[PDB]
Amino acid sequence: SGAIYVGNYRVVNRHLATHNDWANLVWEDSSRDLLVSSTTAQGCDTIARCDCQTGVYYCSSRRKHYPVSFSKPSLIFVEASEYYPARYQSHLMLAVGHSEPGDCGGILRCQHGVVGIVSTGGNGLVGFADVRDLLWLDE
Ligand SMILES: COc1cccc(NC(=O)N2CCC[C@H](C(N)=O)C2)c1
Ligand SMILES: [Zn+2]
């Protein structure tokens, strides 16, 4: 679990969104596993606007943060789950690191701010949904 709070927005994995997220929907994209909902309180996360390929992510299944090198956002095949059929997930970045399903929502950050959130993994890999291209999050 986990979310990004920036201004009047809340960014979560689309597969973990709640009834309130869907009732205050701003935008959602099944192909990216992202959903943004509006909030009544103000968000203070800084979104990174960069092309960093190194950062640190929070891994809840270890209660630890890990440094990682990650790939640039791209279309990556993802196996079927109770949430989606087998498909290509866009804007996804992979890194070699530990992750378990409950780790989804953990933030990945570089020196410029929030890069994305954990969205896929397994086999010693961790995938992050990028949010750096969503320029409307700050305006
Ligand atoms: C987050 O780390 C892991 C490790 C092992 C397994 C997993 N499960 C997943 O990757 N998925 C299941 C939930 C939906 C995800 C999606 N974006 O389509 C796919 C995650
Ligand atoms: Zn950066």
Q: Please report, as a single letter, which amino acid is at residue 52.
A: C
Q: Which two tokens stand for residue 110?
A: 């570089």
81 close to ligand 1 (CB < 6 Angstrom): yes
Give the number of other Cβ atoms within 10 Å of residue 41's Cβ. 8
Mark the binding-site residues, compressed into ranges: 50, 52, 110, 112
Are the C-beta atoms of 34 and 11 separated by less than 8 Å? yes
Residue 23: φ, ψ to 5°: -80, -20
Name the experimental technique: X-ray
Give the experimental resolution in Å.
1.4
| 50 phi/psi in degrees, rounded to 5 | -160, 180
Beta strands, E only, 34-106: 34-44, 54-59, 64-69, 74-78, 87-96
CA of 45 to the centre of ligand 1 (A): 24
Any ligand 1 atom below 6 A from CB of 15: yes
Name the nearest CA neighbour of 37 among 61, 64, 18, 65: 18
